[PDB]
Design a protein around this motif. Structure first.
Motif, short mmCIF file in Angstrom:
data_model
loop_
_atom_site.label_atom_id
_atom_site.label_comp_id
_atom_site.label_asym_id
_atom_site.label_seq_id
_atom_site.Cartn_x
_atom_site.Cartn_y
_atom_site.Cartn_z
N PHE B 64 1.39 -5.39 -20.34
CA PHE B 64 1.22 -6.01 -21.65
C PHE B 64 2.07 -5.28 -22.67
O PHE B 64 2.07 -4.06 -22.74
N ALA B 65 2.84 -6.04 -23.43
CA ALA B 65 3.69 -5.48 -24.46
C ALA B 65 3.50 -6.29 -25.73
O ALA B 65 4.21 -7.26 -25.99
N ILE B 66 2.49 -5.90 -26.49
CA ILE B 66 2.00 -6.71 -27.59
C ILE B 66 2.37 -5.95 -28.84
O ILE B 66 2.20 -4.73 -28.92
N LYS B 67 2.86 -6.68 -29.85
CA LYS B 67 3.25 -6.10 -31.12
C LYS B 67 4.29 -4.98 -30.92
O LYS B 67 5.29 -5.20 -30.24
N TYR B 69 4.49 -2.45 -29.08
CA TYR B 69 4.63 -1.92 -27.73
C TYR B 69 5.75 -2.61 -26.94
O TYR B 69 6.09 -2.14 -25.87
N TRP B 124 -6.03 -2.71 -31.88
CA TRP B 124 -5.49 -2.19 -30.62
C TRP B 124 -6.56 -2.15 -29.54
O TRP B 124 -6.24 -2.35 -28.37
N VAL B 127 -6.65 -5.66 -28.22
CA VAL B 127 -5.46 -5.88 -27.40
C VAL B 127 -5.66 -5.24 -26.02
O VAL B 127 -5.37 -5.87 -25.02
N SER B 128 -6.19 -4.03 -25.98
CA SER B 128 -6.41 -3.32 -24.70
C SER B 128 -7.47 -4.00 -23.86
O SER B 128 -7.27 -4.21 -22.66
N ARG B 131 -6.81 -7.66 -22.09
CA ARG B 131 -6.06 -7.67 -20.84
C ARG B 131 -6.92 -8.15 -19.68
O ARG B 131 -6.43 -8.85 -18.80
N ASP B 154 -0.39 0.15 -17.82
CA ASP B 154 0.04 0.34 -19.20
C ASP B 154 1.55 0.32 -19.31
O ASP B 154 2.26 0.70 -18.36
N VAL B 155 2.04 -0.07 -20.49
CA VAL B 155 3.50 -0.16 -20.72
C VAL B 155 4.15 1.11 -21.26
O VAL B 155 5.37 1.31 -21.11
N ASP B 156 3.34 1.97 -21.89
CA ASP B 156 3.84 3.15 -22.61
C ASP B 156 4.06 4.29 -21.63
O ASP B 156 3.51 5.36 -21.77
N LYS B 289 4.03 8.95 -27.75
CA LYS B 289 3.85 7.97 -28.81
C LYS B 289 3.00 8.53 -29.95
O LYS B 289 2.14 9.41 -29.76
N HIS B 291 0.23 7.40 -31.98
CA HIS B 291 -0.78 6.36 -31.73
C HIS B 291 -1.03 5.53 -32.98
O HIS B 291 -1.00 4.31 -32.93
N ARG B 295 0.20 1.58 -33.12
CA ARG B 295 -0.92 0.64 -32.97
C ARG B 295 -1.22 -0.24 -34.19
O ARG B 295 -2.07 -1.12 -34.11
O1 LIG Z 1 -0.68 -2.78 -29.87
C1 LIG Z 1 -0.82 -2.70 -28.64
C2 LIG Z 1 -1.84 -1.92 -28.12
C3 LIG Z 1 -2.00 -1.86 -26.75
N1 LIG Z 1 -1.18 -2.51 -25.94
C4 LIG Z 1 -1.32 -2.51 -24.48
O2 LIG Z 1 -2.52 -1.89 -24.09
C5 LIG Z 1 -2.22 -0.75 -23.33
C6 LIG Z 1 -3.25 0.34 -23.57
O3 LIG Z 1 -3.09 0.94 -24.81
P1 LIG Z 1 -2.54 2.42 -24.94
O4 LIG Z 1 -1.39 2.59 -24.00
O5 LIG Z 1 -2.34 2.65 -26.39
O6 LIG Z 1 -3.80 3.30 -24.51
P2 LIG Z 1 -3.85 4.85 -24.07
O7 LIG Z 1 -2.98 5.04 -22.90
O8 LIG Z 1 -3.29 5.59 -25.22
O9 LIG Z 1 -5.27 5.04 -23.72
C7 LIG Z 1 -0.80 -0.39 -23.74
O10 LIG Z 1 -0.14 0.37 -22.74
C8 LIG Z 1 -0.16 -1.74 -23.88
O11 LIG Z 1 0.15 -2.23 -22.59
C9 LIG Z 1 -0.16 -3.29 -26.49
O12 LIG Z 1 0.59 -3.91 -25.78
N2 LIG Z 1 -0.01 -3.35 -27.81
#
Ligand SMILES: O=c1ccn([C@@H]2O[C@H](COP(=O)(O)OP(=O)(O)O)[C@@H](O)[C@H]2O)c(=O)[nH]1
Ligand SMILES: CCCCCCCCO[C@@H]1O[C@H](CO)[C@H](O)C[C@H]1O[C@@H]1O[C@@H](C)[C@@H](O)[C@@H](O)[C@@H]1O
Ligand SMILES: CCCCCCCCO[C@@H]1O[C@H](CO)[C@H](O)C[C@H]1O[C@@H]1O[C@@H](C)[C@@H](O)[C@@H](O)[C@@H]1O
Ligand SMILES: O=c1ccn([C@@H]2O[C@H](COP(=O)(O)OP(=O)(O)O)[C@@H](O)[C@H]2O)c(=O)[nH]1
Ligand SMILES: [Mn+2]
Ligand SMILES: [Mn+2]
Lengths: 297, 297
Positions: B64-67, B69, B124, B127-128, B131, B154-156, B289, B291, B295
């Motif tokens: 997922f690559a939303i906003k 991300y 956020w 969004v999480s 999924r 996750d995408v990050d 990142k 956060h 986000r």
């Molecule tokens: O604005 C957002 C927030 C979250 N995500 C998706 O939700 C996942 C989980 O969020 P994040 O990676 O921030 O969580 P963390 O790893 O920090 O727990 C991200 O990898 C993205 O794939 C996204 O696409 N856009």
């Protein structure tokens, strides 16, 4: 049932598995194809019993008692009652040339026994080998409708400790107690290229037993049909594999990797091999026999 | 395909697994329900590649690559090309609110990418969490016809080393890199009985990640549908689990044990946690990142 919808486990209180503590540091507990190798200490039987009871799992146990080997049935079955899949649905299938010699063994609830009459071959080698044909024949009809898993064992044996659902998986073999520490070149695989059981000296994972294998009915049907067909090819070519059905089973399991491997806890000979430190339990053990006397008239 | 007739493996020359030598003595390599825990040294990737190529296995990878991300996609996909299931059939599914922001990444043969447009939630957390709904919606149509396994990440993140068919199984989770050495009472499970994600302090095997799970399409459909339904119950009751989708995933995997568990090699943060001796490889790692900034608008 296998592969049906799986209901949630209930709340259970048990020791937390700790990632930075192995269950066993003295033995290999997983194969290089990610199949568990089943040793005492590697499984929580309470979790496994829940998983398998929630599927209402039925286990078939096949055993051949041909000619003089009918004498082994009473101890085999009475000890099976004490140790084999207790609390689960069990169907024993006793293949024999002497239905009237099958002892009357008292079974726990949810357990049944069927006597299947078959022909007796003259040669003990053929009696041992033709188990593959006979099991595959009975898969095609009875077993597919009656059980979820098949466990196929020798009769000249007794249970001494727990043999349960930890063994169940699509396809399993058991490490031969004589060879679990041996290097592959020392394994007594069939070494003649003229046999369908042939394995070169640079191949092989383990040396598995002819006397304890199993799996889902589908996978046991596959294994037994393949080993029977391979034996028929050898017969047509005038060759008999060095260790008979066991040689063919080893070829099959080299080419079709088992999804679990049972440690030698599951088939041991204490008279020949003692009780090594690496064996925390002796679960299913050889009953002493005079091979020449019991195999011939 | 999964569960089809399996052809024989070819002759292969590889090191013999030795029963009296563990692959890893420093870590637990099998769970108490006999699921492998996947660490470097526990698998022969050549054997596994053969097994899975002979089934013509297709792996779907959801991301997922939303906003904001969307910025993470180029590195994610370019490194996936280097390390993820190379030699196998791969279908990437990129879920985004900005199809035009998906970078044009050059793919190896037998690999494809589909862009799936979805709505962006403001929070956020939502969004999480959503999924789960979105993956379950797409299982019901596309995934069942197009892939054998789904891998949901996750995408990050970036791939730095091999992530291959060793992970594939009906259902898997991944050990969170922050907690693999922690005792269960320290796990950040949801602890309020009012939430569907609630786990008492005396329960729990592991603390799994929301950011890397998968399995067969059927099992991933089950997991994602169950977690979505549980989240909807919590929403109706005015409660949001402490760690969102991850809290629900942990509840699900407590009650439906995974058939493999991935070690923290498979999701690591080197900036936060360094490179411990127990990690022989860092396969898939957090991209740094901010956060708060990334986000929010
Ligand atoms: O604005 C957002 C927030 C979250 N995500 C998706 O939700 C996942 C989980 O969020 P994040 O990676 O921030 O969580 P963390 O790893 O920090 O727990 C991200 O990898 C993205 O794939 C996204 O696409 N856009
Ligand atoms: C090296 C020493 C190994 C000693 C064990 C040999 O066992 C025999 O192995 C044969 C294959 O090489 C084949 O499987 C028959 C097997 O003998 C049977 O199993 C043993 C464990 C004993 O119970 C024996 O009496 C029985 O005949
Ligand atoms: C004890 C120290 C643990 C430190 C790691 C905490 O990571 C965070 O764990 C939360 C659950 O308790 C939840 O999964 C979010 C998670 O943070 C994410 O993952 C980390 C490994 C970092 O990459 C972090 O930046 C990211 O937000
Ligand atoms: O006359 C025979 C010879 C063999 N068997 C069956 O074939 C199995 C394998 O033979 P055996 O146990 O003699 O082989 P070993 O364990 O000695 O290799 C036996 O357990 C029996 O189940 C039998 O029923 N009658
Ligand atoms: Mn025997
Ligand atoms: Mn993330």
């Amino acid at each position: 049932a296998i592969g049906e919808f799986m209901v949630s486990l209930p709340r259970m209180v048990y020791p937390q598995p700790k990632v930075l503590t192995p269950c066993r540091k003295d033995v290999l507990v997983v194969t290089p194809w990610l199949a568990p190798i089943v040793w005492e200490g590697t499984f929580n039987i309470d979790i496994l019993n829940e998983q398998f009871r929630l599927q209402n799992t039925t286990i078939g146990l096949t055993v051949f008692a041909i000619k003089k080997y009918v004498a082994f049935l009473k101890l085999f079955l009475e000890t099976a009652e004490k140790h084999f899949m207790v609390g689960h649905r069990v169907h024993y299938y006793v293949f024999t040339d002497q239905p009237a010699a099958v002892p009357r063994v008292t079974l726990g609830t949810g357990r049944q026994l069927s006597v299947l009459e078959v022909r007796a071959y003259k040669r003990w080698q053929d009696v041992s080998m033709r188990r593959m044909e006979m099991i595959s024949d009975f898969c095609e009809r009875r077993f597919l409708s009656e059980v979820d898993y098949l466990v196929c064992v020798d009769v000249d044996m007794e249970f001494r400790d727990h043999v349960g659902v930890e063994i169940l998986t699509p396809l399993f073999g058991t490490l031969h107690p004589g060879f679990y520490g041996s290097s592959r070149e020392a394994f007594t695989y069939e070494r003649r290229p003229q046999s369908q059981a042939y394995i070169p000296k640079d191949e092989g994972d383990f040396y598995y037993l002819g006397g304890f294998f199993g799996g889902s009915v589908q996978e046991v049907q596959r294994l037994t049909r393949a080993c029977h067909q391979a034996m028929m090819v050898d017969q047509a070519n005038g060759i008999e594999a060095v260790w008979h059905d066991e040689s063919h089973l080893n070829k099959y399991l080299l080419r079709h990797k088992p999804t679990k491997v049972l440690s030698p806890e599951y088939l041991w000979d204490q008279q020949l091999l003692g009780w090594p430190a690496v064996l925390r339990k002796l679960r299913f053990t050889a009953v002493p026999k005079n091979h020449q006397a019991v195999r011939n008239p």
